[PDB]
Design a protein around this ligand. Sequence first.
Ligand SMILES: [Ca+2]
Ligand SMILES: [Ca+2]
Ligand SMILES: [Ca+2]
Ligand SMILES: [K+]
Lengths: 99, 99, 107, 99, 99, 80, 84
Amino acid sequence: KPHRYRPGTVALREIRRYQKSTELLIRKLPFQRLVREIAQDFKTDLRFQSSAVMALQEACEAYLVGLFEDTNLCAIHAKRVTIMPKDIQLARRIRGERA
Amino acid sequence: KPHRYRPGTVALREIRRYQKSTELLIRKLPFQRLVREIAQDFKTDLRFQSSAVMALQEACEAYLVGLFEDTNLCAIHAKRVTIMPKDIQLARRIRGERA
Amino acid sequence: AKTRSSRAGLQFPVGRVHRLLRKGNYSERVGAGAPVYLAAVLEYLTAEILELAGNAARDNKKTRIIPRHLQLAIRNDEELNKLLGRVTIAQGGVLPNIQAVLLPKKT
Amino acid sequence: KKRKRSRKESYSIYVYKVLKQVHPDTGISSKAMGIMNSFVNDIFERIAGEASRLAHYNKRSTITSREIQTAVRLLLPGELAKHAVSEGTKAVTKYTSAK
Amino acid sequence: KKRKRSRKESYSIYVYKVLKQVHPDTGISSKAMGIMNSFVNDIFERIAGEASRLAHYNKRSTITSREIQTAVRLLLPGELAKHAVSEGTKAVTKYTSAK
Amino acid sequence: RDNIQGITKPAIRRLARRGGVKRISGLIYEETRGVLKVFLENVIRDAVTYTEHAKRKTVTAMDVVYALKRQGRTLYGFGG
Amino acid sequence: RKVLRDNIQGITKPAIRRLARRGGVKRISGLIYEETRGVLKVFLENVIRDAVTYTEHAKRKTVTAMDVVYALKRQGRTLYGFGG
DNA sequence: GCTTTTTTTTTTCACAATCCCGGTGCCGAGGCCGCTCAATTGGTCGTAGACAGCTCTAGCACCGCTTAAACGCACGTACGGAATC
Ligand SMILES: [Ca+2]
Ligand SMILES: [Ca+2]
Ligand SMILES: [Ca+2]
Ligand SMILES: [K+]
C-alpha cells in the first residue's frame, strides 16, 4: 500500500522546521501590495523605502507569531490541541490589545 | 425556619456589592507591616510616609482586582466557574509578568 | 592629546557619548563622569551579548555572528531576555519550543 | 565623483573592537551589526532617559555619573546591573586618576 | 511664627475654573482634584515627550505648535484627537489675532 | 516576620469579588499571596532606589508613584 | 498612478499556517485564517497610520524605514536591525 | 477458575525525510587609505549644588477601649473532572 503519515506527524515536522529558521513566512509582494493598500487609506500617492516595507513585515510576522504562541496556550488551557478564534480573542483581551 | 442561600448566591451578592464600592479591601495595618517587612530586605531602618503606604495599597489592590478579572476569563475559557492557580499563571504568562 | 576612552580604559567613545547626552535634551548640564560611566555600561552590555551570540555561532559551526545567534543568546539567557523583553530582533526567529501535550506518547 | 554620501555614525567599530576582545576568531554579519547598533542606541536612550528623570525628580540641573548609576540599577536585572555598576565605577575611577 | 510649606504648584485653580464653565453649581473632592492634577501632568508629559522626539527625529531645535499637533494626533484616539486639534488650532489662531 | 499571612483569605476573596470572580479554589489564596509579594518587591525596590538616590531615610508618596510609572502601572491621585 | 486591489487575501492560508507553525501550533480551526487576517489588518493599520504621520510631519512623500521604526517603538513593539 | 475475544505492548521490516559531508562559486566582511569634521587642549567665567545650621513637621511608639472582622468548625450542594460516545 502507499505511505501516509498520521494526522499531526507532519504538522510537528513543520513546527520544527519553522522554529529552526528565520526566513519571512509571508510572500513578499502580496505583503507589499497590502501595505500600499492600507497606506492609501491615510495618504494617497505615497512611496515606501523597501527597508520600510521589510521592517513592516519583520514586525508583522513577529507579532502574529507571538499571538499564536499566546493563542496555543489559550487552547491548551481549554484542554484542546486546536486553536480557534475564541483562543485568539482571549490572548488579545488579556494582552490589552482590544477591550 | 432554617433558611440558607444555595452555593454561589451570596458570592454573586458580594460581587455586586464590592464592584459598587471603592474602599480598600485589604486591612491596612497588615498591609503596612508587609510593606515594611519587604522594605527591610532592600534598606534597613526605613521610614514611610503614610500616603506612600496608601499609594502602594491602592496600586496593589488595583493590580490584583484586575488580575482576577483576567483570571476569571481564563477560568471561563476552560469551561469553569471556579478560578484556579493555573488560570492566574496563564493570565500572567500572556500579560508577560513571567515566562 | 589623548582620548577620554583610553583615559578610562575603554573602547566605546566616551567623547561621542558625552556629546549625545548634551545634545539629546536629557539635562542642561552633564557631569564629566556620566559619559565615562554610561560608555562603560554600554561596553559591558555589548560585550556580554557578543560572548553569548559568539558561542551560539561557534555552536552552529559558523565563523560570523548573524541575527539568529543574537536571538538565541538573548532569548536563552534569563536576564538579557528581560532587558530585551519588548524587543523584536529582525531575522532572529524563535527558540525551538513545542508544547509538551502536542507530542505523541513517547514509549 | 558626483557627491560623496553624507556621514552616518555608528557604533560598528566599537562593537568590532569589543568582539575581538571576547571572540577573536569570531566575526559578524551586516544585519547582525545593525542589531547591535539598535541595541546600543536602545540602552542609551533608556539609561539617559532614566537619568534625565532622576535629575529632574530631584530638582538637579545635572546628570552626573550618580544619575547614570541609579538609572542602571533601576533599568538592569540583577547580575547584569552589578557588572554594569562595576565596569562603570572602575572606569570612572581610572579616568579620574589619569586626569 | 510658622511659614514652612514649600510652595508647590498645581493646576487646581484652572481645574476649578474649567469646572465652573461646564457645571457651575458642582464642586470637587480633594482626592478628585489630585487625580485631575496627575491627569493633566500625565498628558502634558506625554504630548511634550512626543513633540520632543518629533523635533529631535527631524533634526530640529524647536518644539513648535506643529509638533504639539503631530504628537496629539499620535497620542489621542480618533474623536478626542479631532476635537483636541480643532481646539488647539482655534486657540492659536485666536492668539495670533490678539497680539 | 511572616506578614504575608496578614493577607487573609477574606481580603483576598473580596478583591476577587470586585474582579467579578464567583468561585475560588483553595490553592489560590497562596498563589495570590506570592504574586502580590512579587508585585510589591518590584515596586518597593524601585521606590526605595529613588529614596536612596535623593539621600533620604523616609520613603515618600512620590517615590512610590515614580516607581509605579516605571513599572507601567501609573497612579493618579498621589502627586503625579 | 493606480489605486490598489483587494490584497488582504494574499495573506494566504499556507502563510498563516506557517506562521502558526513557528508559534508551536499543531492543529488549526478552519475559522482561524480569516480571523488572523483581520488581526493582521488592524495591526498594519495601526503601525502604518503612525508611520505615515511621522512621514507627513517631516513633509516627505516617501515613508522611510525609520518612520516604521519610530511608529513601532511608539506602539511598544520595538524593532531592532533597521536603524535608530 | 475458564475462555474467548479485544486490547497493549513488542518485533519485523520498508520508506521517506532529515542530516551531513565535500565541492563549487559568489559577494560582502574586513581592512587599508585619505580626508574631514568632531573630539581635545588649554584658556576664562558663572553658578549649581555641597555643606552647615536651624525649624518643626510628620513619622514613630505605646495604651486602652469597642467593635467589626477573622477564624474554625458542621454540613451539603453544585461543580470539576474522569469516562464514554
Ligand atoms: Ca572569550
Ligand atoms: Ca542658590
Ligand atoms: Ca460538567
Ligand atoms: K518629617
